[PDB]
Design a protein around this ligand. Structure first.
Ligand SMILES: O=C(O)[C@@H]1O[C@@H](O[C@H]2[C@H](O)[C@@H](NS(=O)(=O)O)[C@@H](O[C@H]3[C@H](O)[C@@H](OS(=O)(=O)O)[C@H](O[C@H]4[C@H](O)[C@@H](NS(=O)(=O)O)[C@@H](O[C@H]5[C@H](O)[C@@H](OS(=O)(=O)O)[C@H](O[C@H]6[C@H](O)[C@@H](NS(=O)(=O)O)[C@@H](O)O[C@@H]6COS(=O)(=O)O)O[C@H]5C(=O)O)O[C@@H]4COS(=O)(=O)O)O[C@H]3C(=O)O)O[C@@H]2COS(=O)(=O)O)[C@H](OS(=O)(=O)O)[C@@H](O)[C@@H]1O
Length: 130
């Protein structure tokens, strides 16, 4: 649990949270906002924070991901390992809606209600930073 990169296979991107709270993905290994710290706030729960800006990955009430300055309830995710050995993170708040953290092929954040268990857009591979 050192700063990791959240690599999404659908499109091959690095999930990232911009200074202005925008969350999306990118292919530049040199991006200053792709370094995330993953705090485990319980047995299968986690917090994902932009070390570069302090912001925490959070999903609003409509499934849109954004960067929150404080770590509220909307910032927890149930980190799960899947079949092909990837990690998928589903919003704990909306767990019942099956809303995950995901990236579209073109690297733009994939809306929570547009994601679903099984989709390749929800697969992330933590890679080592620096
Ligand atoms: O009716 C209207 O007027 C409109 O209503 C809504 O629009 C509808 C579409 O009209 C409708 N078309 S359909 O006629 O019903 O088919 C439908 O489009 C869906 C279709 O699934 C599909 O359509 S199409 O290809 O025929 O055009 C297409 O799929 C997109 C994905 O959405 C996109 N996801 S991404 O994550 O953003 O990139 C992307 O998928 C990639 C990914 O790599 C991966 O997807 S995902 O699992 O991560 O989601 C997946 O990978 C597959 C791989 O392709 C596959 N290869 S093989 O060919 O099977 O061998 C294999 O390797 O497996 C993997 C993994 O699979 S799995 O195990 O995870 O399942 O798929 C690929 C991929 O296909 O490329 O790209 C595809 C293709 O798109 S592209 O543009 O052709 O490149 O579009 C979606 C879509 O959501 O748009 O449904 C929409 C939405 O309807 S809804 O409203 O009911 O949701 C729409 O409504 S509105 O609400 O937006 O207003 C309005 O546009 C119109 O009003």
């Amino acid at each position: 649990k050192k700063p990791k990169l959240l690599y999404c296979s659908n499109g091959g991107h690095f999930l990232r949270i911009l200074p202005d709270g925008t969350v999306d993905g990118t292919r530049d290994r040199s991006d200053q906002h792709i370094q995330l710290q993953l705090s485990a706030e319980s047995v299968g729960e986690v917090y994902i924070k932009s070390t570069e800006t302090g912001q925490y990955l959070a999903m609003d009430t409509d499934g849109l991901l954004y960067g929150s300055q404080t770590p509220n309830e909307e910032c927890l995710f149930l980190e799960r390992l899947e079949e092909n050995h990837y990690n998928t993170y589903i919003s704990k708040k909306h767990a019942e809606k099956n809303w995950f953290v995901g990236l579209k092929k073109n690297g733009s954040c994939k809306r929570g209600p547009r994601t679903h268990y099984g989709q390749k857009a929800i697969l992330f591979l933590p890679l080592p930073v620096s």
